[PDB]
Amino acid sequence: QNITEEFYQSTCSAVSKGYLSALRTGWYTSVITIELSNIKEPKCNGTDAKVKLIKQELDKYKNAVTELQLLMQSGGGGSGGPPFPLGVGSAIASGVAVSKVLHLEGEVNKIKSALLSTNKAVVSLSNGVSVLTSKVLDLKNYIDKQLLPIVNKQSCSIPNIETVIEFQQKNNRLLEITREFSVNAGVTTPVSTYMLTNSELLSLINDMPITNDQKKLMSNNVPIVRQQSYSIMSIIKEEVLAYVVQLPLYGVIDTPCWKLHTSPLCTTNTKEGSNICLTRTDRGWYCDNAGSVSFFPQAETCKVQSNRVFCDTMNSLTLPPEVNLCNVDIFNPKYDCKIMTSKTDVSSSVITSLGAIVSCYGKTKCTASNKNRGIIKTFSNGCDYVSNKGVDTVSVGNTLYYVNKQEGKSLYVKGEPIINFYDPLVFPSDEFDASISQVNEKINQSLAFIRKSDELL
Amino acid sequence: QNITEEFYQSTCSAVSKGYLSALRTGWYTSVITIELSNIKEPKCNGTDAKVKLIKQELDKYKNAVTELQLLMQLGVGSAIASGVAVSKVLHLEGEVNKIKSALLSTNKAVVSLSNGVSVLTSKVLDLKNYIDKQLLPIVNKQSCSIPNIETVIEFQQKNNRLLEITREFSVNAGVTTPVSTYMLTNSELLSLINDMPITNDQKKLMSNNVPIVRQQSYSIMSIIKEEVLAYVVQLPLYGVIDTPCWKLHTSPLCTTNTKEGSNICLTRTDRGWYCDNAGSVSFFPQAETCKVQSNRVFCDTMNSLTLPPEVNLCNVDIFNPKYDCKIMTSKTDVSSSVITSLGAIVSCYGKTKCTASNKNRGIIKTFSNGCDYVSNKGVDTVSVGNTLYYVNKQEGKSLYVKGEPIINFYDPLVFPSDEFDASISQVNEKINQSLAFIRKSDELLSAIG
Amino acid sequence: QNITEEFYQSTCSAVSKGYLSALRTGWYTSVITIELSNIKEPKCNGTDAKVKLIKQELDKYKNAVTELQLLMQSFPLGVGSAIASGVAVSKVLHLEGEVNKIKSALLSTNKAVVSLSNGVSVLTSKVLDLKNYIDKQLLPIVNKQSCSIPNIETVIEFQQKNNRLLEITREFSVNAGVTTPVSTYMLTNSELLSLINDMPITNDQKKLMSNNVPIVRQQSYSIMSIIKEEVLAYVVQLPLYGVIDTPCWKLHTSPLCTTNTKEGSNICLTRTDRGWYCDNAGSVSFFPQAETCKVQSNRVFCDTMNSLTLPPEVNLCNVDIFNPKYDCKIMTSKTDVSSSVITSLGAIVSCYGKTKCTASNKNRGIIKTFSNGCDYVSNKGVDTVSVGNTLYYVNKQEGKSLYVKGEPIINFYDPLVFPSDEFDASISQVNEKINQSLAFIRKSDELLS
Amino acid sequence: TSKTDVSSSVITSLGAIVSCYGKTKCTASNKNRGIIKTFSNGCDYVSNKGVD
Amino acid sequence: FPLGVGSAIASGVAVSKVLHLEGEVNKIKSALLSTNKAVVSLSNGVSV
């Protein structure tokens, strides 16, 4: 909760330091069951209004079951369900593996027995994987006892309004579960309270084989856990509906994180096309991770609470810690900072943890202002930084941005914008991807060709 | 009305015009309140069927309350700073109480908060009143006088709203877009718009397009304390209204003359929606952001670039001196189609077969290699390769503008064939730089002859 | 269901073969109706709670109609207009009389093909009749000055019937008149499987659709059309699968770099044409974006609007990347970072630099250690793969995969004249620039002899 | 009469007259809400009702 | 004379009439009876 931020004028980029990692490193999978009645469709003549309502509610129950059968056979949820250099994962790969084990012989029966005198147990499967198992809904008990002696007989006995109503409510969770699955081919994110109530999920977090710190982190940030969790339809058989739930596992916690914001750095020294541009491209989230630096270049694989950053390493790269040296000296010896070049003179603003970066080029009206004081800086051409010191908005052209009013301390690090050191006559401006060294080569090549060409003439 | 479209054969692009702007420039926040008899907790000796149902509902209500308490605790910005600003004010002690007092005599007030913001306040659900009146006497003693069936049904239906507010924020962590119908009934939104400090032109507009207003609004979850659940609804405010808009569609322009893998391709890179906004042009490169109802364009200016008005000249004269028109280049002779506002652009390259067709008489045009356009009059589908694009059938007047495909003017030896983001001037500077190698490596050879 | 995979050491790529196509090629549209009754506001006097509830449920109903009225008046790849086909029908439905042809088509029945003014026939269904339920069991109650109070089962039944209309309105309002996927509320399973059966389509098609209702729902649209004559019509746009049971194969690509040269020396090379490929009527339809395609147990459900159409020799890139017939796409860099691709039944690992890489079993631990370079491992015996601080899980869908040894083609390139920033390149486009940067070094070293 | 194609604004007792001409930016804005009118080319008026 | 017309002190007349409301004068008095310099949050949303 001491969020601090530095701005480097030489590279047109700011770093927010002081965040705490909560990295998703792996998965926990648990099986969740709903006991079902093998009730055949009503077999009687009945016309009372309450007999009609119960008959309808059984058909909804019966239809939803054959629907869930359609899912588990066609497909079954078993699926394969990126920027420049990144990898390509398979999120549900872990959970589907446990889903397929349930299709084996007797694994459904192990669970069914293991959930007879309890509604939460641990099963060790036919492969040695130990999964928590929970029965959340018992429709078989209700449909067979309060509901079957009505439909069973040759002439329907009229039920209560209370039996009509209570069955409509017990049936509800099964139907909503079937809705979510039927619209997602049986894999859902986030995990809803229908799939898993907060009561169940917090109880499930406690019984998990994880640290106490992990339990605290998960049990507090329930919505982030739900957003990061999957729910895979698995099997319906044996009068039992069972689906796998894949929960994030935070194997890296409390390590320091920092966020890098970048913007174009364009020479102002001339008019219209004569300008040339540089831009850092290693923007994103960094977290110290096992003596390396995990880099999250899509900063929206990450979700941010106070002080705390929930990233997913499937969208990460692993870097040597020397990468941070890019934020003190882009021309450092150890690590080759990656940049990009263009000739694109259009103004742009970045909102940081507690500041704003403005890249004012051409003839935009770039401005930062306050609720009650008006404009407190008009930016001139170049790349400038304003903190949120009594600053509430930044306007670039017709676009209004609101500054983060997070409580923190900000440092302006003065320096010479490096784009001024580059010869604009021999400067390369194609680069979608390039490093500082790679640009020096293409300038060494061009300037050393004119070394030989000056000789021969 | 009149929506019209022009097709520039020279640049393989189409500008469809006649639209009217309505661009989000500002926000209005308001506080919505649900008032809860959290104090409630049931216990009693009675065991009727109708008793069980009410007790089950109280656990549902009491669950939703406790969970809601746990849940309390490219140009880049945060869209919801205005709502979060009101949310943080609400946490100041007694600020919640100001709302309660104002909402005591009616259910819609205008409370001025401590940060000098004057915000609409609505009580939308009174669960404390229902529970404490029709429910609390029932299940406080043990003789637990059994309720009628209508109270079992009514409490269940009132409680439903609270349950799906809490369901929404268990997966959304407090912030939803669009603002849902449980977050705010359509009827309530209509009454909110009627009470908003805006022009009567705006009020009519926001009411006519409530579905759009929904998608461009934010629900931000704020507090549960002193038996009041409060959340901020952040609504769009359209400062720009009824300025001209136009949409740019772009497809590749290539050489058909060469019959190999070696051809030069050039494309206008600046497609999207365009609007006149305060003496400049607001340009929306991700045309996915601009909703269109009838001939009206609803965009959020936070997703725009601000461009000089001269950018319009790339549609008249792509080689104009005043605006450095932005283009891209590649060496990919691939055929594709772009369905426009009331027409269709087809780029047909290679051995591909390109069809224009009508649902009554099949194929009614075959496309040559090159870039072409057809109107939506007498065409229903346009087929390119293994793709059948249906065509938009909105009525309007289309126009074909003939010219020499400007890719022909470029000399393929010296063409910079792999420019990702370039312009018309960036490409000529690359061409001339290449002829710089030509004269120098030639007259060097003229030293010995 | 035999699914195979082949990994090519030379190209650092892997192909998963053995799938079967099911591609959206066109659209079938149909009209869904609800028989509303437009009635004036309740007139009856009551404290009887069974009347209070009916009056409440009627207020939700009258709100739902009013809200729905305000909705009827509201890459290298191409750019379609996904709902153009469906909207054209909604535009036809707005003409006078057309609303009446379907009212009387379904006057006798609940499902009838109708001809519309443009001569085209569409299946039309009546999925809900609130007109009669209100008129029969609710009208002589609450039309009168003082109501006959109704049975509790009319109360409960009306809530259930009215919920479908309420949810149809809810989905329409937040989605601004177009909803995808088509929820069970817009069209249930029994209606959809009925609608699937009556479509003018092939027997193979009906079977495929009827067994993949959930995918059909994802690839469909519900488009709000009209409220008038106490009818509520919305066009549903089901996918029409034209390509069925043709071979499909998936391409996986990971980057290829030299290794032994230390630090900045390395050059890199990646195949770019990765994604789904399905044979499609004498060409190859190629889907580059992993988003557009969905797999249900070796069936590949794609959408040709997100396709390219390639000559069938594109497959030869996986055979001989240096072939003459087809010019294979690549890109180049010097960005050497370790990263992995989890293929259909394997893992491609590009372990570079000082990073540790791992293929682990759930019981035997680390069972393979990746040396620097492009390598592959099969899912038979591997459960997880680790690359630095990342843990990828491996798909355990069973099949058998074949390792195809070769020389990493990056080694055949001179590290000095290698063009190391090409973003949209091909093997010839790079042989083009190697010849050039040679010829300058080539002529100028014998101009100076 | 003249041809003065320049933009100007007059603050009235409880409003503001805006004469927005040419290609100038002319807006009325509220301190908590932001820009609330964006004037078209011509003479218009705003009242101090919710305008700062 | 081609120019416009405004009120220069309109910004400071905002704060003046915030002070005119009872409660505000007490706020600043409490902030200053122990030290001679302060930052105070007036109740129309300004920190001065």
Place this chain on the structure above:
Amino acid sequence: NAGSVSFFPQAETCKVQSNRVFCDTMNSLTLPPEVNLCNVDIFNPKYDCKIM
């Protein structure tokens, strides 16, 4: 000023100390930057230079 030219036609408004010019933006007219061309070319195509 912000990609335009602020023009202070009243002599009194701008105060000069050292080489610095202090002005009140409320006593200004905002002109397109092409106003400066009136100094190098009064007959210039773009800006119509104001004369009496």
Place this chain on the structure above:
Amino acid sequence: QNITEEFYQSTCSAVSKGYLSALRTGWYTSVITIELS
């Protein structure tokens, strides 16, 4: 500081260049108090 002036004989007008801007664009208010008896 460097100041330059050019006289345009063609329009009977001179332009002084080289000055540096300080344009007041917003206001800050402070409350100054005197505590009385």
